Amino acid sequence: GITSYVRTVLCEGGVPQRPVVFVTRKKLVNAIQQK
Amino acid sequence: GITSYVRTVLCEGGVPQRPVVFVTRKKLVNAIQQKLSKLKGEPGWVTIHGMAGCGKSVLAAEAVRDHSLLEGCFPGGVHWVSVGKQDKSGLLMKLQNLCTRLDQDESFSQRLPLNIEEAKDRLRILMLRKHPRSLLILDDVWDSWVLKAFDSQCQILLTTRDKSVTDSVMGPKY
Amino acid sequence: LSKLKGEPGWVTIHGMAGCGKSVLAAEAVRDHSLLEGCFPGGVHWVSVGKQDKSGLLMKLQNLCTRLDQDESFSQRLPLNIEEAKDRLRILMLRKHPRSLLILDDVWDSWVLKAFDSQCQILLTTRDKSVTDSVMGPKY
Amino acid sequence: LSKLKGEPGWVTIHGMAGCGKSVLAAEAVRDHSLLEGCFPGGVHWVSVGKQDKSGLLMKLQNLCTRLDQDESFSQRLPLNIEEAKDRLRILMLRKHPRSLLILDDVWDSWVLKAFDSQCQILLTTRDKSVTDSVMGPKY
Amino acid sequence: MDAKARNCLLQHREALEKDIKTSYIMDHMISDGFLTISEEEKVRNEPTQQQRAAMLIKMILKKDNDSYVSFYNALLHEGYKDLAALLHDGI
Amino acid sequence: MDAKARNCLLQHREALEKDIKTSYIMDHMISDGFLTISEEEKVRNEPTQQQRAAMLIKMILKKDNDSYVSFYNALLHEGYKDLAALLHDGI
Amino acid sequence: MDAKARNCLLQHREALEKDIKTSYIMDHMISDGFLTISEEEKVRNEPTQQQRAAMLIKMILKKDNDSYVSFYNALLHEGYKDLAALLHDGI
Amino acid sequence: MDAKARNCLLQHREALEKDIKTSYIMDHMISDGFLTISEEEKVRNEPTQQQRAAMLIKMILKKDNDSYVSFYNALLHEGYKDLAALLHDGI
Amino acid sequence: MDEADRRLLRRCRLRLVEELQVDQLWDVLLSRELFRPHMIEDIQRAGSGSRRDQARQLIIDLETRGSQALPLFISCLEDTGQDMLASFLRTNRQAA
Amino acid sequence: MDEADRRLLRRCRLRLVEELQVDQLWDVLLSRELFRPHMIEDIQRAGSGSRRDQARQLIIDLETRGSQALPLFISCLEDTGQDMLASFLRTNRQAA
Amino acid sequence: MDEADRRLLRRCRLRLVEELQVDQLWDVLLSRELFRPHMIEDIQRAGSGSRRDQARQLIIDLETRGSQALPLFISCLEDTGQDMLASFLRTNRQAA
Amino acid sequence: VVPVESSLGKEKGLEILSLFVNMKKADLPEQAHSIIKECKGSPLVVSLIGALLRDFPNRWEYYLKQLQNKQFKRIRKSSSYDYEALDEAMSISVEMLREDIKDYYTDLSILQKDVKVPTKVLCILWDMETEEVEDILQ
Ligand SMILES: Nc1ncnc2c1ncn2[C@H]1C[C@H](O)[C@@H](COP(=O)(O)OP(=O)(O)OP(=O)(O)O)O1
Ligand SMILES: Nc1ncnc2c1ncn2[C@H]1C[C@H](O)[C@@H](COP(=O)(O)OP(=O)(O)OP(=O)(O)O)O1
Ligand SMILES: Nc1ncnc2c1ncn2[C@H]1C[C@H](O)[C@@H](COP(=O)(O)OP(=O)(O)OP(=O)(O)O)O1
Ligand SMILES: [Mg+2]
Ligand SMILES: [Mg+2]
Ligand SMILES: [Mg+2]
């Protein structure tokens, strides 16, 4: 669940928005994020 | 029934006024507008296409011509860019020109970028803060790198002949 | 001339050479009634003449310098015709809201394409073919 | 050195090579008493060396940049020696009223001609002929 | 900050600059922790109140969403009701 | 002014600034002809008396010998005996 | 403004700056519509009245003939009779 | 001063400024040796008591822990019980 | 003291400085600890020491006496017999 | 605040700074919420704090108080009894 | 005036201004040349001109009256009969 | 370093394939299961096949046999990603290696799809001493 605010920071950052056809990799994302 | 105000926003935008001899296409205009309404927020691209001379531009001009969809939906003004067909050098100028157009205040550096990406930054930033609720309309467009250039993460709708063109781009496309 | 009370619009005036075409243009605006009530914006006259692409470019910059008396807008001048078109449209839109532009002669369409600011401009000439590229009500 | 309490003036110091000529200049000013009461203006040292006309020019600009710490004066630098002379004289006159300038070496007269600001400058050297072009009391 | 927020500011930054007095507003934003002392002096150092307002607004535009609400509350609390009204749209 | 005069001022300008009140002293000076109304307002306009004293002293330092004596007499006449004593050295 | 007007101002701008108080004069010129609020704050913001007067005069010099008369009437109305007298020459 | 101290001040500096009268409090802090005469005049020179309070508090914030207690004792001793209560948290 | 009470004392400035009787209040302000003995004398010596000047200084200092300053002030008014003034103030704070 | 009212306050600068009585206005400006307590203090401390300096700062700050600043100002003038000044201002705004 | 005396007068500010009787001091401050006639009037006109405000301005100005300012001040206190105040100050400076 | 092996999940790719063609996962044709085996979890291949299918839902088996062919020249899509095809990506990686190294990789070509060969055999083909051979591989 993206916060509205998150998108606002992200837009400023300029990271691409995720492709509409995607599938989370919870374990991997979690690992990078925790690390 | 055009509001007086609608014309005032439209003049700033620079969209051409509809030809005096025109005939509404209510169903089509309605469809684009309702769809156009759909990306209420967050980036998004709309492609419109037909064999040559199908009323493709006029509809784009006409769709935004109305107050209801535009006024409630689009606090940001509308900006129209006539892309045409371009070699890499030619494309560069349009970007600077859009830079000059958008920054009426001139607070941003008078110097203009010599690099396409830098212009992309000026657009994104300008769309983000100066005018984000803004919608950008394009005319023609014949190759992908072009939209790659305009791919500001802010809604831009391109109207054209090829429908292949918006394949490089990312985000919801209708 | 009164007719396009608002919203863009072009007026063409024409005759075989030396028919009083300019003087009428000067004379029409010479009067207070039509001009004062109708035209809160000032009147700007441009002498277009006949021009190669390069020559045309200068007139635009010169109109830029003329219109922006304050100089608030960038001292730098556009090297591109369209950018000048933007400076004109924007200047007409905000700086001079009710302004009327008059042109002298004009011999080819791209020229009016250049001046096609969506703000009323009236061109006075010899060819009546000239205002065919343009869009909006024409009389 | 105390003697020219006010009004322009030049002091020359000389010896065969390596006689302690600079160190004395540095040493003389090293003391508080003569400097503090006498010299409300700061002391500026310039290392002139030996110079072709072009080389000399740069030292002047550099002294210009050094003296004008505020930068109130034009950021642009003079391309002409005399103009630099003006910037020095004016700066010495207003910006640093009681200042003393010390020079190192110096091998030809036009050089002091350049520095001849009418404000006290003392040159320390090998030739004593050098300060002959200059005007004002010399010791 | 949000697109609509930043834009709402830009849309009315002129009417704001032509009326608002920065000191009281900066007292609030400083207390709220959305304005720094240095930022405050840069604004105060401006020759005219229109430039001070302009500088404040110039700063707030590059700030987070909470600063937009801090500025909005300050305006209300300080009597700039109509201008706070115009910004109600922004967040 | 004299080297010893200017120096004596500098040597004690801090103790002076920390104690003297400028108005009475400027009344005396403004009458001696060593101070101008404009100079007087620049000094008076200072936010704190330490800065006023500092400004006065700043001005006197670029003045003639007679101004040093005018300032010294003013101090005595105004009760700043100890500070006038410290300046006795200067001329 | 007229040559004689602009020059009469310049010829006496020093005596003016050394005596006139700007606030009352600006009240008049503001009422007459020959001075703006911004212009008024730039003048008021000056550190000393000589600079305020100097700024006002600096501004009036680039103004129309009516402003010369507005400034002249203000001076009279405000008691600067002798200075208004000196400017009588100018228009 | 301590983080909790400085923050307790900031957390209630508004309620304080809206109530407290600086003179009596400065008499105490001067006596305690936690406020100087110059500092005292800067505070006193403020146009309104809200700004005087604001200036005092502005100053105390950059002071040591003992000044926080001096200000707290002064408030109590001066009848500002509820405001002293709010600051009890801070040290 | 909250903004409502501070604003109330401001809006009511005239009625207060026109009506306040301070002669018999002194001891009640002290007895209820609304003000400290030193402040009480500051108030009595305010301006020309006229009833009005005293009354004006009293209501200004009141803003600095905490959250119970107003209801405490009202209690002193009542034990002094200034019922209309106490009534007006009460009705206003109670109008919430 | 629209240009007509801003222009009116400018053209009328003299009459205003010459006639305004601020002593009894303070509480009405606060009571009607024309100005905020902090600004009111700023006005009272304007310049030398003279009636004129206060009056001048008041009318300058008035431009920043919104569309109802003038009619609200007029109401404060009236409840202060400054009828001629209120009358002049009213006749001017009503001359439309 | 040295730092020791500049701090002693500050630490005892309260006990001073909160105890100082200035009415009969004026002539002694003048008679002993501790202050100059114009400063004396500045002190008497300090703030509201209340005993406290006068007393506060007196002790602040004292810092600017030289090395003998304190012992001279103490002498004026004594010839005024303010023995406890003079005693306290003496014991403090003598505690060295 | 977090190291992302290119694998993916069979459950997930079916999830991805469904999104690509917009149907309840079960509703998906029998053909679909097998092509994912070819994909080997390179999500680039899945998106690449998936988009490729958006245009031609009918030619489902074709690409199945195509990947059974083992040539990736057939699969192409314009995409947000910066390459026409998966073959396209690998070519970019190969070039960088210093010329001396570059020849060696090709020898590396012979090795089975799924054999973990003991270092030695690489030593033998190379004819280069073991302490050295490991490092190039590193
Ligand atoms: N009501 C109308 N709707 C559509 N077209 C109209 C109408 N009235 C007249 N026309 C004619 C006149 C115009 O030349 C043309 C509209 O141009 P448009 O549809 O924008 O072509 P286009 O811009 O798609 O062509 P291209 O593909 O070359 O850009 O149709
Ligand atoms: N009252 C008048 N009305 C019209 N023309 C007049 C009048 N009085 C004198 N003239 C003559 C003198 C001028 O040279 C000429 C007016 O020029 P004008 O009608 O503007 O020609 P023109 O500008 O149309 O020519 P071109 O087509 O070459 O631009 O007519
Ligand atoms: N107390 C001293 N006084 C003078 N010279 C000293 C002393 N101590 C050491 N020296 C030596 C070390 C230095 O190299 C040298 C001082 O250089 P200096 O006298 O300035 O020569 P100079 O600068 O006159 O030479 P030139 O004529 O080449 O410029 O003498
Ligand atoms: Mg088209
Ligand atoms: Mg002609
Ligand atoms: Mg040497």
UniProtKB/Swiss-Prot annotation, chain A:
Compartments it resides in: Cytoplasm
Tissue expression from the record: Ubiquitous. Highest levels of expression in adult spleen and peripheral blood leukocytes, and in fetal brain, kidney and lung. Isoform 1 is expressed in heart, kidney and liver.
Induction field: By E2F and p53/TP53 in apoptotic neurons. Translation is inhibited by HNRPA1, which binds to the IRES of APAF1 mRNAs.
Miscellaneous comment: Physiological concentrations of calcium ions negatively affect the assembly of apoptosome by inhibiting nucleotide exchange in the monomeric form.
Description of its domains: The CARD domain mediates interaction with APIP.
Known role: Oligomeric Apaf-1 mediates the cytochrome c-dependent autocatalytic activation of pro-caspase-9 (Apaf-3), leading to the activation of caspase-3 and apoptosis. This activation requires ATP. Isoform 6 is less effective in inducing apoptosis.
Subunit structure: Monomer. Oligomerizes to a heptameric ring, known as the apoptosome, upon binding of cytochrome c and dATP. Oligomeric Apaf-1 and pro-caspase-9 bind to each other via their respective NH2-terminal CARD domains and consecutively mature caspase-9 is released from the complex. Pro-caspase-3 is recruited into the Apaf-1-pro-caspase-9 complex via interaction with pro-caspase-9. Interacts with APIP. Interacts (via CARD and NACHT domains) with NAIP/BIRC1 (via NACHT domain). Interacts with CIAO2A.
UniProt-recorded name of the protein: Apoptotic protease-activating factor 1
Gene from which this protein is expressed: APAF1
Full-protein interval shown: 105 to 139 of 1248
UniProtKB/Swiss-Prot annotation, chain L:
Tissue specificity comment: Ubiquitous. Highest levels of expression in adult spleen and peripheral blood leukocytes, and in fetal brain, kidney and lung. Isoform 1 is expressed in heart, kidney and liver.
Signal sequence annotation: none
Compartment(s): Cytoplasm
Disulfide bonds: none
Domain of life the protein comes from: Eukaryota
Substitution effect: residue 90 to L: Activation of pro-caspase-9 independent of cytochrome c. Increased ability to induce apoptosis
Upregulation: By E2F and p53/TP53 in apoptotic neurons. Translation is inhibited by HNRPA1, which binds to the IRES of APAF1 mRNAs.
Extra facts: Physiological concentrations of calcium ions negatively affect the assembly of apoptosome by inhibiting nucleotide exchange in the monomeric form.
Domain-level remarks: The CARD domain mediates interaction with APIP. The monomeric form is autoinhibited in a closed conformation through a bound ADP at the nucleotide binding site. Exchange of ADP for ATP and binding of cytochrome c trigger a large conformational change where the first WD repeat region swings out, allowing the NB-ARC domain to rotate and expose the contact areas for oligomerization.
Self-association state and partner proteins as the record states: Monomer. Oligomerizes to a heptameric ring, known as the apoptosome, upon binding of cytochrome c and dATP. Oligomeric Apaf-1 and pro-caspase-9 bind to each other via their respective NH2-terminal CARD domains and consecutively mature caspase-9 is released from the complex. Pro-caspase-3 is recruited into the Apaf-1-pro-caspase-9 complex via interaction with pro-caspase-9. Interacts with APIP. Interacts (via CARD and NACHT domains) with NAIP/BIRC1 (via NACHT domain). Interacts with CIAO2A.
Job of this protein: Oligomeric Apaf-1 mediates the cytochrome c-dependent autocatalytic activation of pro-caspase-9 (Apaf-3), leading to the activation of caspase-3 and apoptosis. This activation requires ATP. Isoform 6 is less effective in inducing apoptosis.
Record protein name field: Apoptotic protease-activating factor 1
Provenance organism: Homo sapiens
Organism phylogeny: Eukaryota, Metazoa, Chordata, Craniata, Vertebrata
The encoding gene: APAF1
